Design a protein around this motif. Structure first.
Motif, short mmCIF file in Angstrom:
data_model
loop_
_atom_site.label_atom_id
_atom_site.label_comp_id
_atom_site.label_asym_id
_atom_site.label_seq_id
_atom_site.Cartn_x
_atom_site.Cartn_y
_atom_site.Cartn_z
N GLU B 28 0.83 -1.20 0.00
CA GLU B 28 0.00 0.00 0.00
C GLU B 28 0.87 1.26 0.00
O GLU B 28 0.66 2.16 -0.81
CB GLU B 28 -0.92 -0.02 1.22
N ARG B 29 1.86 1.29 0.90
CA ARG B 29 2.81 2.41 0.97
C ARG B 29 3.66 2.51 -0.29
O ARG B 29 3.99 3.61 -0.74
CB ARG B 29 3.75 2.25 2.18
N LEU B 30 4.01 1.35 -0.85
CA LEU B 30 4.94 1.28 -1.98
C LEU B 30 4.27 1.45 -3.35
O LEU B 30 4.96 1.62 -4.35
CB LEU B 30 5.69 -0.06 -1.96
N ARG B 164 13.07 5.58 2.17
CA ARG B 164 13.91 5.71 0.98
C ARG B 164 13.17 5.26 -0.28
O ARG B 164 13.20 5.95 -1.30
CB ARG B 164 15.22 4.92 1.14
N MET B 165 12.49 4.12 -0.19
CA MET B 165 11.82 3.55 -1.36
C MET B 165 10.55 4.31 -1.76
O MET B 165 10.08 4.18 -2.90
CB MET B 165 11.56 2.05 -1.17
N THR B 166 10.02 5.11 -0.85
CA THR B 166 8.85 5.95 -1.15
C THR B 166 9.26 7.38 -1.53
O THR B 166 8.40 8.25 -1.69
CB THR B 166 7.84 5.98 0.02
N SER B 167 10.56 7.61 -1.70
CA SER B 167 11.06 8.92 -2.12
C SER B 167 10.82 9.17 -3.61
O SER B 167 10.90 8.25 -4.42
CB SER B 167 12.56 9.04 -1.82
N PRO B 168 10.53 10.44 -3.97
CA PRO B 168 10.30 10.84 -5.37
C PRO B 168 11.47 10.51 -6.29
O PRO B 168 11.26 10.30 -7.49
CB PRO B 168 10.17 12.37 -5.27
#
Ligand SMILES: CCCCCCCCCCCC(=O)SCCNC(=O)CCNC(=O)[C@H](O)C(C)(C)COP(=O)(O)OP(=O)(O)OC[C@H]1O[C@@H](n2cnc3c(N)ncnc32)[C@H](O)[C@@H]1OP(=O)(O)O
Ligand SMILES: CCCCCCCCCCCC(=O)O
Lengths: 337, 339
Positions: B28-30, B164-168
């Protein structure tokens, strides 16, 4: 006691850059003056006038690798003879994998070589020697490497930044002061089954005592170390005294009957308090913290290597390895040259 | 063949971390990152085969989790801490670089001034290493009882990896390199080992074999807030190394797969495990997995699975149990327990 364990080879690496305490004090001078510090704790009290630093980008595994190569040469064996490699350093580049596996990769060990790290503050090298000694006596392996590289570059860089900050308090200063007594360096030892190396020094092992209730006294990572200097000195010496009494029992030790004392290097008052406790001739206690500071678990084997290279020792000499580390843990063992 | 004699397992216990974090929640977050990167497959749930993992509270240190396990193991062995002559902590997680986590656990428990303590670290194989070191002292009769303890904390690596993995500006490469961190899990285990004379009816530990491939030390590199992994290469080189180890295991343990009753295997993913069992002709009914709901608990995985096997009533007297694992290094160890 170990009956068939010997020390086939031994080596140390001195880090190449000198940072004197005079140079640090000039950096710390504006802080001293706003905190009303008038005393030179490093030079006049601790007795540490200099320490060594690596070049930038030297990792613990690099340092340990350098030492290992020297030790193999000192022992006249190729890496293919090694059946066990243990890394005992406090400094570590990752949590996973072991720093030992990185060192082993650099060296090119065989697929039969068992490797892992031991961590135990400044006592780990002695711990490492005993774990290897037990595998050797059992016939599991013929030769073992115990390696230890320490890096204090980052802890000096970050600690000095903190101490020079306009917000620094005397509480914080005194609590991180011990970090400025550490040094860089590396050591490595080749241990072997005695029937393979009849001329080599014999390692008998020794005794271990502990005071694990004092585990909060000194806590550190690569960038920062916090220390209760006063209590650590007091309790550290208490454990050392208890262990040395226990050693006199099981090893038969009498102070006059020992030729060398290879002691962990932390400070002049620390050292003098211990030797005075037992009336040990200070001449028999080689000291390097004056110019190298505290190199942690590598300290003891570094001194032993320096003694060897000095052409000091003679066959039959009894050498007491007196190790200790934050924990507290203390181990005292005998080597017969 | 230098197998251990008269070394027994007097007590054994595990601790399951209390907070469940599902892969559905993680996805969901990813999702925005998946969409931007064109990833259309559930790489956690369908590929790796992990559906959930457990986390601690934020304020739980490696030593805290290891201490919980230890107290439970002492109860299982029905002895007090005053009997312990050796304590080894084998976790990847650690409170500090110094002092050892073992000395923190030892202080919490109240060990005697005669107790020997230190950490051993070797990625996911360290608990077996700790058992072997304890066994050598026990066989010689230097001590009567030993504690081998291991608490793992993955809270921080989850928190930081997910940010980090949800960064633009996260790159496809950084995303792939760090994905394996999301297969990790929290948990703890501890074992009380003893000289067989003191516990005549307890299981026996024989030890076993180890083979290595240290030229592959770069494949999985981990710290408190980040893990970087070459998943593809780990699979290929792992099975290779495990193959050497099995040949050696037939030599010194006299192993035949059909003759073993349980295989307790360290696990990194569902396809890796299936590749392993297929490769060596293992009956999958004899392989218990907790990866789907607990993920990879590092070096605690093997004894946690063993402890769960004991608690399920799946182990009986005389059962021959294989402890198997490949760990970052690379290292591979195979040892036998006789229940
Ligand atoms: C990343 C890993 C790398 C890896 C590197 C590998 C190492 C890893 C292993 C971890 C290493 C560790 O465990 S390190 C822990 C061990 N090292 C230490 O503890 C460092 C402390 N060294 C010492 O020699 C001592 O404890 C002293 C000097 C701090 C105190 O000696 P002592 O004789 O009590 O001194 P005492 O009279 O109080 O001191 C009198 C005077 O000194 C001052 N003084 C006393 N203590 C302090 C203090 N803590 N900070 C400032 N000033 C102090 C007093 O104000 C007074 O000044 P005035 O009245 O004259 O004005
Ligand atoms: C045997 C020397 C007596 C003084 C040493 C006290 C122990 C200090 C503790 C610090 C050990 C370490 O550097 O890890």
């Amino acid at each position: 006691l170990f009956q068939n364990v010997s020390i086939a080879g031994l080596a140390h690496i001195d880090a190449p850059h000198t940072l004197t305490s005079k140079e640090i004090n000039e950096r710390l001078q504006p802080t001293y003056d706003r905190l009303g510090i008038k005393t030179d704790v490093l030079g006049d009290v601790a007795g540490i006038h200099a320490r060594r630093l690596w070049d930038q980008d030297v990792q613990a595994s690099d340092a340990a690798t350098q030492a290992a190569r020297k030790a193999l040469i000192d022992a006249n064996i190729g890496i293919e003879k090694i059946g066990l490699l243990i890394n005992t350093s406090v400094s570590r580049d990752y949590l996973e994998p072991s720093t030992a596996s990185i060192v082993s990769g650099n060296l090119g060990v065989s697929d039969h070589c068992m490797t892992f790290d031991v961590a135990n503050a400044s006592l780990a090298f002695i711990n490492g020697m005993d774990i290897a000694a037990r595998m050797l006596e059992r016939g599991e392996i013929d030769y073992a490497l115990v390696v230890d590289g320490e890096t204090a570059n980052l802890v000096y860089e970050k600690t000095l930044e903190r101490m020079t900050s306009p917000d620094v308090t005397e509480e914080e200063f005194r609590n991180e002061l011990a970090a400025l007594t550490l040094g860089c360096g590396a050591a490595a030892m080749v241990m072997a089954r005695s029937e393979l190396v009849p001329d080599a020094p014999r390692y008998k092992g020794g005794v271990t005592r502990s005071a694990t209730e004092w585990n909060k006294l000194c806590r550190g990572n690569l960038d920062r170390m916090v220390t209760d200097t006063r209590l650590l000195l007091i309790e550290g010496i208490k454990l050392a005294q208890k262990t040395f009494v226990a050693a006199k029992q099981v090893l038969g030790w009498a102070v006059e009957e020992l030729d060398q004392f290879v002691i962990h290097q932390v400070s002049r008052p620390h050292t003098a308090a211990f030797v005075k406790s037992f009336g040990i001739d200070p001449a028999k206690v080689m000291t390097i913290f004056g110019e190298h500071g505290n190199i942690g678990p590598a300290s003891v084997p570094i001194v032993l290597s320096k003694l060897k290279e000095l052409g000091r020792l003679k066959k039959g000499d009894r050498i007491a390895l007196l190790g200790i580390g934050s924990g507290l843990n203390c181990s005292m063992a005998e080597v017969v040259w």
